[PDB]
Design a protein around this nucleic acid. Structure first.
Lengths: 103, 78, 89, 94, 66, 78, 104, 92
DNA sequence: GGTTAAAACGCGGGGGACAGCGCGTACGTGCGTTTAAGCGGTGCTAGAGCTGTCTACGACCAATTGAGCGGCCTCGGCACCGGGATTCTG
DNA sequence: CAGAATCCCGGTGCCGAGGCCGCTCAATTGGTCGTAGACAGCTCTAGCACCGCTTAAACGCACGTACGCGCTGTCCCCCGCGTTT
């Protein structure tokens, strides 16, 4: 059976294992490294998608669009820190106006 | 002179997106110069990557690698 | 090959009745690739500083703790530990 | 005899830009570090570590104050103010 | 596209581009300019001005490290 | 409360090295806060490296590695 | 028998660079010419920086080269300043610089 | 236990570009740091390039590409010239 | 445990930070004319891409041996201290 | 033109930059082997080019008052110096 089934994850362990063994990072890899990394990736993906869905429902939509990803990421304290130097195509910016410009 | 193709209202539009209320008359040339410099750097890196790859066409992945080298990661064109 | 189907399988678990566009799918693909590269490179450095041949779950955990912010890092470590425990048990 | 306000300020500016020594006292800095290092209780430190920390901190503060002075000048002021530091750190990306 | 082609001619004659390769350049440039203006507006406000001046742009670039 | 040990004369000397002529009376607290934040970040990273290394003593190379991680790249300590 | 450094006419060690490449997890194979090229580049950079360092030492009437001299040499050259724009040198200090509006 | 360094090589270079000039230990350490830093930068860039084109071998061509990408202005030109000269002399 | 460099506290009053005003004209809101940015349609093909030789090249192994890191005296480049003539401020 | 800072010439003597001598280990050479990849060849599709078309958009001009600016009065607070801990 697949290692993901044993680990109860959703991302493929085996492909991560092959990428590690192939990407010239070290001489050896422990059995647990790919599973841990896959778990981390799954958690991060789930977090991003949850915030994206919340952003989408907030605008009466059923399909997640890059603008929604932008709003979700930038409307979060820690994800913005994690993705401070990343530009999202067709993402736009956050609506805000400086208080010294409104009449 | 294709730098003049970056129209005055286009720069006003970018500023409006940025949240600028009133624009001075010299902002446009300064922005033209800045954009020219930035594009020159990025294109230089991209063509360097291409020539190393022996290609004649300039792939989008090369632009992505160049932007990464500058330190501006771009999601979408992978 | 990519992570598209895996992203879907993740998406349907946190939002059943929703969809996602191909552009968003590519963005997520880039994000997964980027995080993987970051963590892997950090682990490779750590394994070099101690002159050890093998990258281990401990190395990945060190990298995660270094790279992510706190509240996020804590949950990441918890999930990884649970997964690696279930892998053997 | 008195030197007019600002003259001795320029004298200090010159002499301290000429010199290369450290400005912060070692004992207070060491106490500060060993206090805020309590992350992991009962830690031990190499001296070179504290020396590198002091070096980096003084360098970072100097670099920050340079931009602070630039901002204050842009504001057509001689005196620096906290808002100048806040602007510097905002633009700097912190 | 014409501007990109023109400035690329200075590095290698007789080049060819991908549509996406140009779209990515346009995206990055628009984002860069948007960020630059965002900082410049703060600079101008700190100067107690509504109008935005080239000196503000220069200050933004200087402080940012460009 | 050892943050008060970063004395007003010390901050004034650092500013002088920075090229400041006139200093407001409120700069010192802000400077203390900024120094505290920076030191906390660096020390957290250093302690992380030390704990991974299985060491009681925090070495200088660890401080260097943290600074390299944050993008400072201090020379002169190996 | 002659050293590869001697065979290449360089002063930096080809062999140590080769070993560091092959023991640095960079690729499966290393080209026989890569270390020679790299050693040449490093030797050129070293000579380039040391020239300005010695010029600074002569300007300051000193026989020894000190970190303040290295700071002056690096920051007084534009290309080096761009190359090392994120490097802090211990005991290096800063450049004398006073704004024209601060002094009468 | 013995450890590697670059001190003697740097001193030999200095004795070539300044026959009468001393260098302090702190300066020597800084120079070691600089040499190590540049070596790491170039090597990592070369590995990244070698990975982009799916090549097992890092050759002088990749190193030259890396140097060209990494050094600004005429400095890259002179660096390339020096490396090419050294390689050419090496072959003969 | 001792030395003394240093930090903190008081004071005078000059520096400049601030609120307020009248003024000039730059950029805003609006209009009519002109431009050429995008569509889509048809067409060619440069050049990216997928099948396959074989030897140029590097990895690896043995044996040799001298290049590089170190220990230990060596000695002069430099800071430090002193008396003095001399810019600069006020 | 007082007087606080600064540079200048000179003597003292030390500590750190260096030469010499030992000896690990690592750098060189000769040799074997597998295969990386440079190359030879066949395939075809996005890019590029021309054309008629719709119309999206830029631009010049009119003209108003918003706001950028120079100047003034004044009081808020910072420096420069002396004293104490």
């Amino acid at each position: 059976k697949t290692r993901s089934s044993r680990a109860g994850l959703q991302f493929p362990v085996g492909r991560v294992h092959r990428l590690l063994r192939k990407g010239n990072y070290a001489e050896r890899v422990g059995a647990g490294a790919p599973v841990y990394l896959a778990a981390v990736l799954e958690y991060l993906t789930a977090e991003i998608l949850e915030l994206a869905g919340n952003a989408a429902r907030d605008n009466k939509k059923t399909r997640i669009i890059p603008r929604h990803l932008q709003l979700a990421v930038r409307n979060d304290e820690e994800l913005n820190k994690l993705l401070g130097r990343v530009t999202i195509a067709q993402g736009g910016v956050l609506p805000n106006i400086q208080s010294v410009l409104l009449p | 002179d294709n730098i003049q193709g970056i129209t005055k209202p286009a720069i006003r539009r970018l500023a409006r997106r940025g949240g600028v209320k009133r624009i001075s008359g010299l902002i446009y040339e300064e922005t033209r110069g800045v954009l020219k410099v930035f594009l020159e750097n990025v294109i230089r890196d991209a063509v360097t990557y291409t020539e190393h790859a022996k290609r004649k066409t300039v792939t989008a992945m090369d632009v992505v690698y160049a932007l990464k080298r500058q330190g501006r990661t771009l999601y979408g064109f992978g | 090959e990519s992570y598209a189907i895996y992203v879907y399988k993740v998406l349907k678990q946190v939002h059943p009745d929703t969809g996602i566009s191909s552009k968003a799918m590519s963005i997520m693909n880039s994000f997964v690739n980027d995080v993987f590269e970051r963590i892997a490179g950090e682990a490779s450095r750590l394994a070099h500083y101690n002159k050890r041949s093998t990258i281990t779950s401990r190395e990945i955990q060190t990298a995660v703790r270094l790279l992510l912010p706190g509240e996020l890092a804590k949950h990441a470590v918890s999930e990884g530990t649970k997964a690696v425990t279930k892998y053997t048990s | 005899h008195r030197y007019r306000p600002g003259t001795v300020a320029l004298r200090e500016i010159r002499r301290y830009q000429k010199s290369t020594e450290l400005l912060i006292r070692k004992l207070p800095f060491q106490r500060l570090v060993r206090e805020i290092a309590q992350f992991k209780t009962d830690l031990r430190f190499q001296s070179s570590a504290v020396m590198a920390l002091q070096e980096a901190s003084e360098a970072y503060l100097v670099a920050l104050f340079e931009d602070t002075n630039l901002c204050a000048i842009h504001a057509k002021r001689v005196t620096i103010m906290p808002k100048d530091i806040q602007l510097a750190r905002r633009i700097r990306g912190e | 596209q014409r501007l990109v082609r023109e400035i690329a001619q200075d590095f290698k004659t007789d080049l060819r581009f991908q549509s996406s390769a140009v779209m990515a350049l346009q995206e990055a440039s628009e984002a860069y300019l948007v960020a630059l203006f965002e900082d410049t507006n703060l600079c101008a406000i700190h100067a107690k001005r509504v109008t935005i001046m080239p000196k503000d742009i220069q200050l933004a670039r200087r402080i940012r490290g460009e």
